Structures are given as structure tokens and as C-alpha cells.
Amino acid sequence: HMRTSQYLPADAVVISHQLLLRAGMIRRLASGLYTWLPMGLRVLRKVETIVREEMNAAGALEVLMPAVQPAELWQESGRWEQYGPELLRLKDRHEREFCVGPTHEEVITDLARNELNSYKQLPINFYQIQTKFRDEIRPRFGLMRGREFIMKDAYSFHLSQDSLQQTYDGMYQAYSKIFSRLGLDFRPVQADNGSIGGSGSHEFHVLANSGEDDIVFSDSSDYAANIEKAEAVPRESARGSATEDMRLVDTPNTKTIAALVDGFQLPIEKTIKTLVVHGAEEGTLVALIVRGDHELNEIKAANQPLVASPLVFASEAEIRAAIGAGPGSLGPVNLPIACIVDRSVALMSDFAAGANIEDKHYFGVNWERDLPLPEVADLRNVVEGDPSPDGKGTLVIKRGIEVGHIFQLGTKYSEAMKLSVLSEQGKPVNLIMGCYGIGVSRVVAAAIEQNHDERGILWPSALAPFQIALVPLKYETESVKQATDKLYAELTAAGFEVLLDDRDKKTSPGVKFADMELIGIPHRIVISDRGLSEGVLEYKGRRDSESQNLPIGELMSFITEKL
Amino acid sequence: HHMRTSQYLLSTLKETPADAVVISHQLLLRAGMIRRLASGLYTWLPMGLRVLRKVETIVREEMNAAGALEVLMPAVQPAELWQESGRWEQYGPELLRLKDRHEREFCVGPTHEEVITDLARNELNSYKQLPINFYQIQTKFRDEIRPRFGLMRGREFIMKDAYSFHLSQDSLQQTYDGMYQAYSKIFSRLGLDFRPVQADNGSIGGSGSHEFHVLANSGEDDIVFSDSSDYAANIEKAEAVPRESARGSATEDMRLVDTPNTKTIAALVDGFQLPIEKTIKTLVVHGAEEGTLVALIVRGDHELNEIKAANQPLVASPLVFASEAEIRAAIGAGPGSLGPVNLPIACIVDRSVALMSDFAAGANIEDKHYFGVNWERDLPLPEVADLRNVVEGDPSPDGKGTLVIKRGIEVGHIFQLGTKYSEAMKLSVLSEQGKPVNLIMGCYGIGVSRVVAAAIEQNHDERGILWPSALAPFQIALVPLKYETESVKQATDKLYAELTAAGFEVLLDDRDKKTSPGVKFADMELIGIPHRIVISDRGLSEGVLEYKGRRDSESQNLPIGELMSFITEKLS
Ligand SMILES: Nc1ncnc2c(F)c(-c3ccc(F)c(S(=O)(=O)NC(=O)[C@@H]4CCCN4)c3)ccc12
Ligand SMILES: Nc1ncnc2c(F)c(-c3ccc(F)c(S(=O)(=O)NC(=O)[C@@H]4CCCN4)c3)ccc12
Ligand SMILES: [Mg+2]
Ligand SMILES: [Mg+2]
Ligand SMILES: [Mg+2]
Ligand SMILES: [Mg+2]
Ligand SMILES: [Mg+2]
């Protein structure tokens, strides 16, 4: 028998973390390090089973690579340094250097250059379900920002871009099947691939109110993207006419949009933010301008050719030396550095701008009349109700928990690590690669974030640790004991996963009921002598308002249907 | 959606390293099962992983049947827990230590006693929860000084590790016996020829442990069996008793002999035509009493058992041998010139030495020996103890039969730990009566990676691997001849789906004509697939397939209409 006597705050702030602790599914060992207790492991394994099945069905080959990895491989890719401090670095007893793997691009590439020597082996897609380590600066949110976590990571190798796309498409489809079978409300979205436009990366998000990531959808089309990636187009069709002459105004204590809007009674749509960043050309600055009610999108900013990637903001001293004034008094008029303005900015008229002189602004600025319009680009974040960039409907912003991310890597790794195979024609080809990650331990948490109530966890059917809780009242009575054990055996025989509450009188029936519901068991059966005498059992669903009575004989028929 | 050789078999050119000297290591590389990342670190390739998972499944099934509860604990573990037990320092250089970005100290777990004890002292609060046994199948790291023998002495390896918690020794014994029985079912089901043996607890500690060994010619452990009883012990643990019942009558007088350049048993034997059984070795070690020495004596043909030596109350544990300088200062003579006559330090002799007569010993004078030494007459008998290793043909210590020594690969080890951890880490539960009880503990380890290699060490032939039935990565290999032809393709794919639907694991050899049938046939046999079916046009025209078993010498024809019945028969 599987029995309750065996199986069953402060740092816990999100609901999934709180309930995983309370339901006896995990325990903290240290910052970002959790043990799966017996009840939680059951859930984790059900996630793992569905992932494996769908990866297998998509033709991927399961491997299992080491956690500890030699530094030399990471030095080949440059990530030994470039990965940053989330990379856990160490030395062994021989003073040799290693990391604990946060991901396995380098290891799989090393494998690939030894094991792939014929075009007849391609395409091929290896995956593993394996424990990663990432030295997250502030481990939090329980399983969702852990240090040690389970990921399914897959890596595909190809002789052509078109081949990669075929596998990538299959992985996207597989992912959809995975999250559907896990019974999660989820959405795939376009994600940043490090260039303007393109479609070489997608995320899969579980929809939840606590979700850290903003995702954007058209209400009328298939348009879907992370806010990092979401294309912003202007609400206005044309630039307004010039109705005011430009003029220099004294503006002491005016260094924010609010101070400008409230101080001088300007509409926010007549103001701008000027952000100064480092240019790609060494020692240069670029000014990026968005309208006052908007925000600079730092991915869009870095993806501009003129702008250094990754994105570095100019210091105040850099700004003052270059421009002749500091933050708060900046603008495009008499600006001695390169400038890029957001699409919305290009359509503005009679607008205000810091004068590039301390504590002054120009009012009544108009493009063309008072200064040339600079380069225009999509620089801003979309906001709720903006037009869909495909021209079909308007945008809506939801919160999402990232559980999957897929990537087209081109030849980044194969070039650096000399992974090449001869074509049928005999041309050496650097293999084109994709990689595909699911946060498996994250998924367990994400499910609770999405699915919970006042009584505790609600699992999707695929994730429930057990299907049926048997709650005997006074299990010490032979009639009950026999009636319960018989029920356990039949149900277990019929392939159902049953938990038998074997706890003594010192655990009340109410406590028992609340426990089975906290843990998220979808069905309970209650056995008692009062009921055995009348040939009835007491059944209740997890999301049923009321219990009901079930003739002992019809039970198996009735339970089978539900499950 | 087929499992295909062009995908699974990978490169034709295999890692062929200088240090691949054991068969399992060689064959795991050649058969495309594992690949080396670095010293002691190996990737499971697709075919290899299939085998690992079958081992895990069976292990999981039997642990669960024995009432154990599966958990999964972290690999990275805080140093503080390890300082609680003292193993932070005492585990030694196999413990991989590190620091995080915040300067916090950790190890990668070589084992998880501290973590599970920390769990238990937060999770176990009532006697009603006990007994309880938690286990995991989880990846360990030990910084093996010289990683070798492929999977056998890796640094990263998979272990099933279980820990049980108890209010009484009798409770522990029940679970421990249940774990012993579960292990026996595991290794039987894996189809290995194996033996459980009595063992020493070693560094893990406690009193009472058994090892499970796979019998193989390359086994690193010497395991000892009676030819007439169920007596079985690691040579570390095996009790040695003398062949002689009594001390023989003294036939010679004791005499001092000049023995320059005579520092070995061999040199004494050869130089003086002495029987080796009339010579002794005297090994000087550090005493338990600080700054003391103790001499340990075994017969010239025998070896000192270092575990037995350390177990002697007079002898410091762990064992430390005295330096030549320490010996010369204490005794006034050096190694090669030592013995029990006029010895100014304590002395323990082996049981066999106590019964010696007319023997030769170093005189405790440089370059001299005494010949014709007899106990009582020439010197008193000192303390006697079991100090030596058993040798082939010795009396079984249970009184039944004589001993035979075999070679074994350790694949499991179970221990009784007592309150070692529970006392150190303050793990206590109140009894039914209200008394605090430091929880009594057991722990149980299987080397899951090791098992895979051990199976091959035991089971191989000239054509490659011989898997146990439960271990074969696939049951059937389909080898179509001219798979490119529609008629062969059609039948082959039909065969693949029908066999797969019945539940069989099938590998389809889809490789083109640059891989000859002969090579294909050798490849499937190397990988250890037990059955193959060849599809050909000449075959299909006659309504037959060509079947061959891994252990057969000849193929045989199979009427298509009897495929399932025939193959089903073969796989049972
Ligand atoms: N701290 C954490 N705690 C718990 N879960 C986590 C988690 F799941 C991820 C994760 C999940 C999916 C994903 F794809 C990525 S990724 O975007 O970094 N991509 C890659 O690693 C690529 C794809 C697979 C090969 N390499 C990261 C990251 C951190 C944590
Ligand atoms: N280098 C290696 N390469 C591959 N496999 C290895 C391997 F499996 C073991 C092993 C296996 C079983 C076992 F019991 C022990 S133990 O005797 O140390 N005991 C414990 O760890 C106890 C029991 C379980 C909880 N703690 C060690 C050791 C080294 C390697
Ligand atoms: Mg959480
Ligand atoms: Mg750029
Ligand atoms: Mg080996
Ligand atoms: Mg530990
Ligand atoms: Mg070693």
C-alpha cells in the first residue's frame, strides 16, 4: 500500500512555492537547492514521461551528458568568460578547471565533431533530461528561479538552413503537444533572435497572473510575441501640421516627463525621452528617442547597427562631455551625436525637448522646419491596445511564465569548435544548429501558479500525484480495514494510482479531507461502517461542491468513467 | 517513425584509447554506448542510455516493492552540513569542493548521508512515521585520483542510494534484511551471476555490512567462499584460522645467525634453504596510545590484513606504518632485522604464528636473525589475533569445508550505521513511551553505471557483447537487403510496425550498400542484439524471412505467416 503515514513560510512568496512546501512536495536544502519529497517526485516524473514521449515521437535521440564539464570546451566557444557569473566554476584535485553545466552546447558540439562524419547521418537531434546548475544571483520563487533544476535540452545538426527549419518546426509542434498533454493553458510566441525581424526564436509560456514576462497577442490574428520582440507601429497615420513657432524656455527642476507634463501643462504625447547609449563604433554615442508615454525597448535598441550590442548606456559624465548638458535637459535640436527616433516620434508636432542646455527646453519643435528628421526605427515597447503590426486588429498584453525556448544557432558553435561534414558533393560544411529547452522542474511550479484555489493545488489530470484518495474512518475496524484494503487492491489492479489514508484517530477526518485537497488529489472515496452497512461509499470530486453516495458495486464502473 | 542504425550507431571510427584495458570499457566504446568527455566523465550515447534505463527501471521496481520511498536530492550541497558530520574534512580528496559567486562553500555530493539526515530531522517528528526508508537514483561525483576502467571507476556515476530510519536495532535489521533480499531480486532479474558477501563497513562506518559482487575474471575484489557451506566474505572481512591444531615440539635450539643483505623473506629462504612456513614478517605500526609502536607478525607466506590490523585495540586506526627512522630509534635495528625476541615494543602475532615451531626471526640486531625459535622456551607467547588474509585452501571459519577465493566486481554495499549521523546531527524522535531516541540508521548503495559495465565483464565473446535479456538495448535487428527496393522496404516497414505493436524493441538497419551485409551482421552482434531478421527478395519470393539468434551458428528460414508465434517463442 501507498499510505499517508509515509508520504505526507517567509522565503515562500509566490503561491506555487507556498503550496509545494505545504503539500509536502519539496524541501529547501539551501538557496535555490530543493529536494523532491516522495509526493513531488511523482509529479516531476509524470512531466518527464510526457516530454520524453513527445521528443521520441519527433525523432530525437535521448542521451545523457555529464554535469561537470572541462573548461577547455567552454574556452573554445568563449562562454567560459562570456557566460558570466551564473556559471559555476571549480577545480578538481589535479588543479584542472571545470564548470557545472548550465546547458550543454559545447559538450554536444564536441560529441558531434567526433560522431558525425557523414551527410547520411543528418539531420539528427539529440536530447537529454538532465540537472543543470545556474548561479542565479538571487534564487527565488521556489522552483522557478532555482540554482539546480531539471531541463530537457535538445540540439539538432543540419547541412542546410532549410533542414534546420524542418526540425525546428517539428520541435515547435512537439512542444505544443507537450504543453497540451500537461493540461496547461499556454501560448507560443516569437522571441528575440538578436536581429531586426526574422523568426529564429520562439518561447512557450504558461499563462499566469504572477508571470514575470509580458507577452503580446493580436485579438484578430495569429500574431504573438514577447514584448522584447513585439513590433511597435504608430497609432497615428500622419505627422500633424506645425501650429507653434519653436522657442527656448527656462525649465529649472524639470528633468522628468512628469515635471514637464505637470510643470508646463503639456500633453504627454508632446514630450520625448532621450536616452544616450554607446555606439558600435568605439568611443561614439547614439541618442535614442521615444515619446514621453513610451519606454525604450533595450533589445530593439541593441539590434540597431549603429548601437553597441550588448547595450551600454552612456554615463552622466560621458553625456555632459559630449552634449554640453546632462540627463533632464537633452534633445534632438543642436545634438552633436547621432540620433535615432522611434516611429511614433517621427509623427509628433509642436513638441517639447530638452535644449541640450542645462535647465532649458525648446517648445514648439517641428520636424523639417526646425531640424531635419533623423533615422527612424522601431525602438519602443508595444502598449495595451496598440495596432497589431501585421495590420489585423489590436494588441493585448498578458503575463506569462517561460517554460520552453527554441533557437536557431546557425554556425555559432560549429565555426568556433570546428564541426564540419562534407556534403554529398565534397564541400566542407559547418553544421547549422538548433537547440530547444524545456524547464521541467519549472513546469511543475508553473502548473500551480496557473491552477490553484482556496483549498490548495489543482493539478491537470496528467500531473496529479495520485488519482484516488481512500479515506477510511476508523480503519482499525476489521470491516472497514477489509473494505478499504479490498478497494485499494481492485483499484490498483485496474491501473489506478491510489493513496490510502492510514492515519490514526489523532488525525481528524476533516484534517484528512483538507490534506487530500491541499495536495490536489482529484478524487476521494470515504469508507465507514455506517456506509458499509447500507452498501454505499461516499465519493467527492476535488472541484465538486458536494459529496455523494455510490452503491458499492457501481463504484468501479463509476470511477473508471471519471478517470 | 523508426529507430534506425544511421541514427543510433553514429561514427564508424571509434575512440580507441591506450587506457581501455578492460573488456567492458573497450566494448562500450566500440558498440557506440558511451563517449569520453574528460577523465572519468562519460556521455551515455543513445544505445547505451537504453541499457542504463532498463537497469534503473528494475532497481526502482524492487526498491518500491520493498517499501522504500523515492526522493530526489540535490547534487550541490552546503559545506555546513558536511562540517556537522565532520566529513567536510574527513572524506578526503575524493570530495569535490567549490564556492559559489557569494563565497559560500559547497561540495558536489559523492553520497547523501548528511542531506537525508537534515531532511529526516525536519520531516520525521513522530514514531508513527517509523520505520521509513528513502532512496534516490541520482548522479554522484567522486574525485577518483586515477579514473580508469571506463564506467567502473569514473568520477561522475549513477548510484541508487537508500537510507532507512529506525527506533530500534531490530527494526533496522528487518529493513536491512529486506534490502538484502531486494538486492538479490535486482541482480537475479538483471540476469547476472552474483553473490552477496559479508563485508567491512570501511569509511562509511557502523558495524555490519554486506557487498554484492558480480563474478568476473577482472574483478578487483577478492571474495572468499567455503566449498561446503554458504560462508561468503570479502577477503577484507574473512576470518582466518590455522590449518594446524597445536604447536609442534621444539626440535632445534635457538641460535644467532649472521644475515647481511638479508632483508626479505625471499632472501632468507634462498640464502639458508629455509621453508617459507618457518619464517615470519614483522610489520611495525603506530599504537593507539600516542607515540607508541606495535609490532604485528604474520607467517612468511602470509599477508597482513590491514583492516584486521587497525581493528586491534592496541593499534591506531586508521593504520599508520612506522617509518624506518622510528623503527631504528625504538628497536635499535632496521626493517629486515626485526622479530619478537628481545623486542622493546608491544607485539601481536597472527594465530598461525602462535603455532609455529623452530622458526626464524630477525634478531632485533642489524644483519642478524635467530633460527630455531620456540614459543614459551625462548620467549613468552605475546597476544594472539587474526591478523592475516585467508589463502586458497584454508579452513572455513564456520567449521564447514575449505576456502576458495574468487574475483568480484562490487555493484552493491549495504550498511548498518547505528547513531553515527543521528548523534552528530541531532536527529531524535520520541518513542511511544516519551523517551528521546537518536534514530538508528542503515544505508544501501547500488552502482547503477557499474552494473552496466559489470554485465559485459561477465558476459562477452569474440563477436562482442552478450547482454542479459533484461539489458539488451533492442530485442530484434531488422537487416533488409536492398532496403531501397519498394518490395523489401514495404515488407520491412510492415514487419517493424507489427513487432513494435506487439511490444518488441526493434532496430532497423537502413544503411546503404557502402555498409556490406557482413559488416551489418557484425555490428548487430557487437552491440549485443539477441535476434535478427533478414529481409530479401529471394526470401520474400518464397514467403520466408531469415532469422538468426545471437547465440546460434546458423540462420534458419521463417515462414512469414508464423512470424509472431516464432519470434514470441524466441523472446521467452
Ligand atoms: N533558474 C532556473 N530555475 C529553474 N528553471 C530554469 C529554467 F528552466 C531555465 C531555462 C528553461 C528553458 C530554456 F530554454 C532556457 S534558455 O533560454 O537558457 N535556453 C537554453 O538553455 C538552451 C536551450 C536548451 C539548450 N540551451 C532556460 C533557466 C533557468 C532556470
Ligand atoms: N568511481 C565510481 N565509479 C562508478 N561507480 C561507483 C560506485 F557505484 C561506487 C559505490 C557504489 C555502491 C556503494 F555502496 C558505494 S559505498 O560503499 O561508498 N557506499 C555509499 O556510498 C553508501 C551507500 C549508499 C549511500 N552511501 C560506492 C563507488 C565509486 C564509483
Ligand atoms: Mg515555485
Ligand atoms: Mg547593434
Ligand atoms: Mg567499463
Ligand atoms: Mg550529504
Ligand atoms: Mg583512483
Ligand SMILES: [Mg+2]
Ligand atoms: Mg600468519
Ligand SMILES: [Mg+2]
Ligand atoms: Mg584499533
Ligand SMILES: [Mg+2]
Ligand atoms: Mg596504526
Ligand SMILES: [Mg+2]
Ligand atoms: Mg546514523
